[PDB]
């Protein structure tokens, strides 16, 4: 029942937005380059938690000039619940009118501790999403990990090689060290934060994205409908109605 | 903290053709041409343009008085 | 200014507060034997002997009282001694009264007598009373006393029909209920809050009497509230100069003369002081102070003292016990009973009177569960305000009837109910004060009130009041009760807050004003009469007799304290105060400055719920609240389980108050006596504190914190968390039912779809399904629709349509529901715009439209969010995202034309000397704009567009063009177009002397009539006209050659093309361009406009080249403009105007003290109100007559010609005012006075901005809004009107600058900031009004097919603007395909509507031809909707009653104003009019027009506003009736046509058909007609034939009267009609028949018709009609004008065969009784 301590800690999450470091200089120049607006990143960090991972699907479009740059125009929050190692998301991919023009570009998630490698749980999740829905191209989708460090948050991006995609779908182990996991599976893509344009959010209608507290009401086969509205923070009152109701019972 | 160890790898971010005055005789591009949007027995002639002088007592009884 | 010193307030603050005593030595009364008990010292004083009656001291009975005041006194035979002595003062005079009487005297009767006098000076003769003409305010210390007084006064005054209600508590935005009642009873702080709100003025407008009950509370800590209230009342009395009576009922204490001075009470005539001897029941009071300090032994000693004292009275008495705790009453009762049982075995049968009798009575009533069951069998009983239910109202009855022997009660009984007892004992005297945080000595006032009940007034002769307290330092009660405790002032402690409240209210604006205000405070009087106690030395007092230095030091210290907290910006140099919004909020919500500083420091845009609760806990209101060790266990228990975690704060007070607030919101219960008390205290504070925090964050623009604070406010109000089911807000639903819904984790939104059966199944209770389904739709819910169109590249015009979607219940929702409209950016982090939306029950279920402007920045946001949040209901909001995906921003406008620095052109630049003579007197040189334009506008001949700010002198450029035209062509003709008729008249008046006189060139002004317009255009060199007149003149341009050949066409104020009536201007300008293209002799176009951003579009539209386009920036005006904008964050319009009243005078003094000022107000009434307010404000200051610069002896000749009394009175003081009600002569006289400089200030209505021909140094605009009756809302001024008002603020000759101050609602401020300083963007609205112009073009054969209409659309300005700003016109792209598709759709939509109304005929989907309806609509210049309605409604048997209703339904009258409160007057008029309309909506222009037309026909006299509206209606009535005549004659219906002709002729003469024809004659009355009728005179012909002497004897005559009557008779038509049928014998079936009729008048008179009542000028028009009355068929009709001779022939087809009978009718549209009728027969062969 340390949710109170965690909420007190997460209340001071805007401070980390004052400084953000982005990995670079390790990426091969060949391939796509992804550009993330600052406002959606700041909001995503603000609505996150220090010990529970959250995730959001990325939708974007290439600028008309060149197709080697991907502009992430939107972030979609879906009914989800996460541990400190992985995020559980519904099987259904988000579907909405505004998403027709924008192609999926992968997903972005936070993690408590910065790690040099890419989490095998993340690799498995990405590979399984690829296998389930063919709308996700093998080379056009990326995993953006926003790891939390003392002071600031360190963004980095990864993509899956064909060998990694093959391994992930057949991987069943969910431990820290699965069988036959090697760094050749993933690769680093180039990502830049830019404030020259603004993105938006889409959140589930008739409900909220966070299901960490009412986890029993979350099923992988659940269906949802999106709406155009900014998400609420992790410890918002609507996310934990049991805490408010039980206290009244007291 | 890899950012302090290898600052070169990481990058710090603050994060805060028309035609006017048409007439029936016109041609060429820019001419706005209309296209379907595919969504009185009595004649009024005037329409469409063309003290105490003590006068003699009137004959009367040809007035309304009602 | 004077030197200012800083004095520590805490040094001069009386620390003891209400416990401070200045009596020092206390002289005991005559009987003062002291009985020490070795445990508690006792002091005894005897009852005072009543004062013997003096001479003529008989008690005055009700019979001697005034008869009107006898009612409300039933139950009393004669007044008491004190009441009788004050009878004269209360009833025979209005002197302010200060009553000092012993407690229990009965001052309530004196107050009632004063109220009766106030009512009796509102008797209203036959009417019972003037209930709505006055108001009385009652101020009482305790709310229980408030309720008691409300009940008593209601019972007394129910005979007078006056309702008295109490408004005390947390009421905010009080409803009309306060306006409904006349006597308001409340607590001092409650009234103080209401006054601080700034809405007090609309309440106290009728207030004439305020009663300050228990004004001896000044010594207490709440004294400063009373001091502030009294000082504010006195200052308002002096300012408004309205006498308001102040009556204070005080206890007998020293320094009462200081209070009498403080109350403006004359010591000789208003001060009444009665010592304790005058008490109706003298009492023997005993005081018991416990010497021992042992807390454990303290209660034992106190109980023993109570018991021994009670046992003395035994049972043959009645003992009342007072305690100060709800639970301590039962404790005391049970302890006393038990100790009587155990100590001496004293049985309770002693209490019971006469053994078993009446024991059954209490035994029968013993069946209660409020612990009375334990005590009711005996004499004991309890009575507490809290948790008593109905047991209170029954224990009161039982004790009143002398059955309960011992009654222990809380102090609330002393105020709530008047049940006297023989002896009263007060226990403890300690009360736990949560704000103090400890136990404190209770208020002296409450002790006095509850000790004033000793001894029944009727059944007792002696009283015994025993007061038990501590022996140490608590014997000062002797000074209190023995008339020895002086009243002291505590205002020093709360001086900064009182000063800040005054500063916010505007009563003070500088250290001088604050020093003057401090004089009315009781503290100043106390310092005068007792300097030593307040730290003032005698030397300082003698060297400063008025204590000016001390008062200024106090003012400076308070100002420094306020400035430190950033509440008031105060500069030491000038000693001036500036009000900050933080200070305004602090004053409105009654929070201390320390709390404000804490909030200002702590509040951040990123605060969460935890930090928000912590910030609330850190308020200074709870500084004294500490954490008691005994309650720490339960505090920790609650701390572990909380929904909002508490940041750190293990056991600090902040944690305590935080968890208390959370537990209160969660409706939790606690087991601590003290804990619940401070929980209640923090809740009561939390209401206002959270409201103030929400206001602060909302004003700061933060969005997330605003939402969180609003949710917290609503949760505190409703005592429920947001996560709970919203249905808990309805208190009717059972708790378990809603609990069942909450158990099912099921969203509330989905519950709308389910029906009652499905709901019952889901909740598992089928019975409750119907109630739940009913309550679901009761929940407030709105639907949002947004229409978005971009104005500029940085602003968007948003039109939000709000459609309520819930069933309205007055029980639940109430009179009105409030909503907050919030628009936010993508991140929902900044509130770009916000406003307050008020939904009224009357207008519920109706769509509401809200228009506002929001900015857009360079990175185009994806979308904006619009939120409508309920101000009261939890979980009641609607969010609508406004997508910008498809937005096309307008093109950035090019830079304005640079003002070249050229040496000014001398007037001798005009080569012609005659042209020079026009200006060589006015000025020697032109302003730089004119010099720059001169070459192009004079030497060149091409089209030129001039855009300059108002007052730059564009009229001189127009005159340049006219002079060039005259120079090149002697007979050249110029046309000048001005959108406003007032501007046209002003320009005509100006140019008449310039051209007609000096240059001898004809100048004419166009009028309504077409023939006169044609004559003027033919003989006029310079034509001045409005868009509508020139439109009707130029529609047939293919026929009138004069319209074709005009050398020059000048358009003034072309920027009004955007505003209303813009489409007519656009159409006439486009038609002029089209004519210029055709005629082959170009018509030069000179366009004058304000600074236009998109001047390129207008120049391209009008053919002006880029070199000849002069678009200047607004900062180019010759007289620089200094513009200031002030925002008033008040939603209510009346409250906003009342708050604006004084800032008008303040701005007048600040900006232009000695220079002319013009004030613009919304309405006509507000003009006079503002003039009077300015005069009162100036007279309140020592200036008085400062706005009058000439002697009154100079003014009297001007005032003689005036008629309005109020206007004359105001002008006598130097302030004038203007409105439409004033006669044109009066307005000209006022303008002449203002221009001459006699008066400095004039107040004008907004509708006179164009009309006025005067300039001022300062212009003040008020509220920038006006009520709209049709939409029952307020719509802001058009920007063009604001620009015109600003243009008045310039005097080039004598002013180096022009200043303008705009006062408007806070939201509107940004719009004025954007638009006023920058060039104005103008769009077109021709697309909405396309129908009439298309119909006119079709009739004129300009548009012969559907493609010709799309060609015609290309010439318009709309076509130009569609490319530049497509989204404004609902256009997607700017491609040729998009534009062509949109134009084709628009023209097809318009032509389909035209064909649906049978106005035109569409053949083969391409060709269009006109029809009769369109023809007549074009001929009479009438909207096509109106002619369609005429065609539909008119049938073959409509009468005049139907005709009037049809006419009043015309679209021309849709714009008739519906002003405020006109509904009552119209409803009253509705009974008077003959033809009553069924189901009248009085907020409907058509009903108003019908009523006004009927009144005009009935010659009824009514208000000036309604007369002004009647003139406007009669302006169009004639053309509408002629159109109806043509419509009826078209179908062939005879009788309706004749009825319509008679309707026209009787509207002209303003009489009904039944009225005798003599009503037309001037100076004729009902008796005049009666005398003629008896003689036999029935028609106007008779008097003309009657002899001069003979007719003179019939009626009374005067020279003027008979002269006018004869003049009318000469004008009366004497036409003779002779008709001829051509070839009567030879008429063939179906062959044409020619009927030739010749008519000629013998009189041969000239001139217009004589219609006195009809406003405009009418020329008589006749209707020769042939028809068959038998078959009601109109065969033919021919309209003509006589012109003293005429020869009219009309023809028709002979029907069938045989002899036919026809009736030739001759009718008139001007007079009555001149209509002729002939019958002829024809034969068909």
mmCIF file of N, CA, C and O in Angstrom, chain C residues 5-26:
data_model
loop_
_atom_site.group_PDB
_atom_site.id
_atom_site.type_symbol
_atom_site.label_atom_id
_atom_site.label_comp_id
_atom_site.label_asym_id
_atom_site.label_seq_id
_atom_site.Cartn_x
_atom_site.Cartn_y
_atom_site.Cartn_z
ATOM 1 N N UNK C 5 4.675 58.709 9.380
ATOM 2 C CA UNK C 5 5.426 57.873 10.302
ATOM 3 C C UNK C 5 4.821 56.474 10.342
ATOM 4 O O UNK C 5 3.661 56.258 9.981
ATOM 5 N N UNK C 6 5.626 55.512 10.785
ATOM 6 C CA UNK C 6 5.216 54.114 10.864
ATOM 7 C C UNK C 6 5.061 53.755 12.335
ATOM 8 O O UNK C 6 6.016 53.874 13.114
ATOM 9 N N UNK C 7 3.862 53.328 12.719
ATOM 10 C CA UNK C 7 3.564 52.908 14.079
ATOM 11 C C UNK C 7 3.194 51.432 14.072
ATOM 12 O O UNK C 7 2.351 51.005 13.276
ATOM 13 N N UNK C 8 3.826 50.659 14.951
ATOM 14 C CA UNK C 8 3.497 49.244 15.061
ATOM 15 C C UNK C 8 2.071 49.077 15.567
ATOM 16 O O UNK C 8 1.734 49.515 16.670
ATOM 17 N N UNK C 9 1.231 48.444 14.745
ATOM 18 C CA UNK C 9 -0.169 48.268 15.115
ATOM 19 C C UNK C 9 -0.308 47.383 16.345
ATOM 20 O O UNK C 9 -1.145 47.649 17.216
ATOM 21 N N UNK C 10 0.513 46.334 16.442
ATOM 22 C CA UNK C 10 0.443 45.435 17.590
ATOM 23 C C UNK C 10 0.693 46.179 18.896
ATOM 24 O O UNK C 10 0.159 45.802 19.946
ATOM 25 N N UNK C 11 1.507 47.236 18.852
ATOM 26 C CA UNK C 11 1.738 48.042 20.045
ATOM 27 C C UNK C 11 0.448 48.698 20.524
ATOM 28 O O UNK C 11 0.189 48.768 21.732
ATOM 29 N N UNK C 12 -0.373 49.179 19.594
ATOM 30 C CA UNK C 12 -1.624 49.846 19.925
ATOM 31 C C UNK C 12 -2.812 48.895 19.975
ATOM 32 O O UNK C 12 -3.934 49.341 20.229
ATOM 33 N N UNK C 13 -2.595 47.602 19.745
ATOM 34 C CA UNK C 13 -3.693 46.644 19.752
ATOM 35 C C UNK C 13 -3.975 46.180 21.178
ATOM 36 O O UNK C 13 -3.076 45.802 21.932
ATOM 37 N N UNK C 14 -5.255 46.217 21.548
ATOM 38 C CA UNK C 14 -5.711 45.682 22.830
ATOM 39 C C UNK C 14 -5.680 44.164 22.719
ATOM 40 O O UNK C 14 -6.512 43.548 22.050
ATOM 41 N N UNK C 15 -4.694 43.554 23.383
ATOM 42 C CA UNK C 15 -4.468 42.120 23.232
ATOM 43 C C UNK C 15 -5.648 41.307 23.751
ATOM 44 O O UNK C 15 -6.027 40.296 23.148
ATOM 45 N N UNK C 16 -6.244 41.735 24.864
ATOM 46 C CA UNK C 16 -7.335 40.986 25.479
ATOM 47 C C UNK C 16 -8.576 40.903 24.599
ATOM 48 O O UNK C 16 -9.415 40.027 24.837
ATOM 49 N N UNK C 17 -8.710 41.768 23.599
ATOM 50 C CA UNK C 17 -9.879 41.711 22.736
ATOM 51 C C UNK C 17 -11.140 42.047 23.504
ATOM 52 O O UNK C 17 -11.260 43.114 24.116
ATOM 53 N N UNK C 18 -12.099 41.124 23.479
ATOM 54 C CA UNK C 18 -13.361 41.300 24.186
ATOM 55 C C UNK C 18 -13.210 41.244 25.700
ATOM 56 O O UNK C 18 -14.160 41.585 26.412
ATOM 57 N N UNK C 19 -12.056 40.818 26.206
ATOM 58 C CA UNK C 19 -11.819 40.720 27.638
ATOM 59 C C UNK C 19 -11.153 41.964 28.215
ATOM 60 O O UNK C 19 -10.958 42.038 29.431
ATOM 61 N N UNK C 20 -10.810 42.940 27.379
ATOM 62 C CA UNK C 20 -10.169 44.153 27.862
ATOM 63 C C UNK C 20 -11.160 44.998 28.650
ATOM 64 O O UNK C 20 -12.337 45.095 28.294
ATOM 65 N N UNK C 21 -10.673 45.613 29.726
ATOM 66 C CA UNK C 21 -11.505 46.442 30.590
ATOM 67 C C UNK C 21 -10.772 47.742 30.874
ATOM 68 O O UNK C 21 -9.575 47.730 31.178
ATOM 69 N N UNK C 22 -11.486 48.860 30.765
ATOM 70 C CA UNK C 22 -10.943 50.172 31.088
ATOM 71 C C UNK C 22 -11.605 50.786 32.313
ATOM 72 O O UNK C 22 -11.318 51.939 32.650
ATOM 73 N N UNK C 23 -12.484 50.042 32.987
ATOM 74 C CA UNK C 23 -13.173 50.579 34.156
ATOM 75 C C UNK C 23 -12.212 50.786 35.320
ATOM 76 O O UNK C 23 -12.381 51.721 36.112
ATOM 77 N N UNK C 24 -11.202 49.921 35.440
ATOM 78 C CA UNK C 24 -10.235 49.946 36.543
ATOM 79 C C UNK C 24 -11.014 49.731 37.835
ATOM 80 O O UNK C 24 -11.567 48.633 38.020
ATOM 81 N N UNK C 25 -11.082 50.703 38.740
ATOM 82 C CA UNK C 25 -11.896 50.584 39.942
ATOM 83 C C UNK C 25 -13.359 50.366 39.585
ATOM 84 O O UNK C 25 -13.899 51.030 38.694
ATOM 85 N N UNK C 26 -14.002 49.433 40.279
ATOM 86 C CA UNK C 26 -15.404 49.097 40.044
ATOM 87 C C UNK C 26 -16.193 49.425 41.306
ATOM 88 O O UNK C 26 -16.042 48.755 42.332
#
